[PDB]
Design a protein around this ligand. Structure first.
Ligand SMILES: COc1cc2c(cc1Oc1ccc(C(=O)O)c(F)c1)[C@@](C)(CC(=O)Nc1nccs1)NCC2
Lengths: 92, 481
C-alpha cells in the first residue's frame, strides 16, 4: 500500500536522499525504531545509510541518505505511508 | 513620496501577530528592520555550487515590516534560513524549517502566526502535507505562486490547498512577465499583489534600498496585509481571513489576455488591498474550481469547500460542452460539488460557491420526470434557496424552486438563514457569453443556466457567467438583513 514519489522536474531531483513518511498516528518512538530497523536491514545487505533527521510535530517520519536500491525494502517497513525523494526549492 | 505598491494596496477609504520568514540569511541590522527581526539562524541549506547571500531575505523582511517601505510597519518577525547564497534549498530543509516553527510555538505559545514561504519547487506530496498540518495547527501560510509563467498547481508549497498563494502584478495591474520568467497563474492562486519594481531594504548597506520583482515580493505584501488583519481581528479562522483577502481585493483590473486561454477563467482577477477599516455581519462567498476530471468517458470532477465553509451552489463547465451536468451530494457530513463528463470528452470542471454562513443547509433532490420538466423546491417556511444543480444520465438531449430538463435530476441547496434575504436575477439574450450580476452590497451564492447548448456556467466574483456554443444566465443573490 506504501507508494514512492519523486519530483516531476528532473533537474530538481536529489536522488540518494529520501523523506520516509509514516502513517498519521505513528509515535516518535515508532519512527525512531522504523529508522533503526531500516539501517539494520540495509547493513545486512551491505548498504551504508545515514539518518539525517527524525520528524515529529507536523508529520511522523525521517530523512535518510541511502542508495535508491533500498526503496522496495523501505516501502515494506511497518507504519510507512509513502516515500519521497528529496528535491530542490528556489527563491521566487 | 510613496512607493507605488504601498499606494496600490491602500483602499478607496481608509484611516500581537508574528511573521515567520523561511528564506536566505538576512541583514538583521538594516535600519528598516533593526530591533524587530529575530534571526533564529536555524540553518538547513545545500552546498553552494554576505551582501549577495542575504539579498533576497533582507528585501522580503523589509517588504513585510520595513519602517519606511514596509506593508506592516514595525511588525515582529522571526527568520529561519532554508535557502543558500544562490537562493537554493531543499524540500527536506523546508520541512525541518516548518517543523521548527511548530516546535517553537509548542514551547513558547504566542498569538496568531503568519508564515511567509517565498520559495517554490515542483509539486511535493510531503511539502503539501506539512503545510496542511501546520495550517490545521492554526497557522496562516502565505506562499509565492512561482515565477515560471505556469500553472501554480504544479509547484509546492503553492499548490497546498491550506495556504494562501500569491501571484505578481505590476503598476499597470498586469501579470509580471520578465523574459522567460513571469508570474504563475491558475486555480491554485488565491489572488495577486504588487510584484514588480518593489522598493525594499538592500543588504549592500544598513540604509541602502533596492527595487526587486517576483511572486516572493507579491506574497510578502499579502503576509503584511494578513498580519494586520489578524492583529485587528485575532479570532479570524484561516477560512475567514482568506474570504476577507478576496472581498477587500480590487476586482477585474487584471487584463487576462496575458494568460493562456483555458487559464483565464480559472485565475482570480484580484489585486490584494488592505481593508477600509480595522473592524456588522456580512455574507462572504468565493468560487472554488476543481481539478479537470480527465479525458475518461465516465470522468468526474469534485469541488469541495475549505473547513468551516458552506457549499451553497454547484455548477460545471466543459470547453467542448460535452458534459452530463453536476450534482450537490453529502460526503462526511458536508456537501460536495460533483461534475460528470460526456462521451466525446475532453473532461469537465466542478465549480463550487463556498460561503461563510455560521444557518442549517440541506440538499433537496428530484430524479427525472413530463412536459413540465424536473422541479424541486425549498418547501419549508423561512428557508432560502441558495443554488440549483442538474445532472443527466442520457448521453445527449418560481421563488425557492429549481427547474431542470425532463431527462435530468434536479438538486436544490436549501438554507434556514433568518438573517438572510435572497433574490433570483435572470438575464436572457438570443451569443458566446451571457452574464448577470448581483447589485452592490449583495453576494452571489449561485450561478446557473436556464434549461441552446451550454458549455457551462461559473461565478466570477458576484457575476454569473453562462457560456454557449435563447440562452439565460440565472444568479441567486443574498445579503444580510
Ligand atoms: C490543489 O487545489 C487547490 C490548491 C490551492 C487552492 C485551491 C485549490 O483548489 C481546491 C483545493 C481543494 C479542493 C478539495 O476538494 O478539497 C478543491 F476542490 C479545490 C487555493 C486557491 C486555496 C483554496 O481555495 N483552498 C481550498 N481548500 C479547500 C477547498 S479550496 N490556494 C492554495 C492552493
Amino acid at each position: 500500500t506504501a507508494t514512492f514519489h519523486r519530483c516531476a522536474k528532473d533537474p530538481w531531483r536529489l536522488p540518494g536522499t529520501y523523506v520516509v513518511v509514516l502513517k498519521e498516528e505513528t509515535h516518535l518512538s515508532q519512527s525512531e525504531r522504523t529508522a533503526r530497523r531500516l539501517q539494520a536491514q540495509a547493513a545486512r545487505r551491505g548498504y551504508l545509510t545515514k539518518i539525517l533527521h527524525v520528524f515529529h510535530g507536523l508529520l511522523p517520519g525521517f530523512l535518510v541518505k541511502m542508495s535508491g536500491d533500498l526503496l522496495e525494502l523501505a516501502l515494506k517497513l511497518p507504519h510507512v505511508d509513502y516515500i519521497e525523494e528529496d528535491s530542490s526549492v528556489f527563491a521566487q
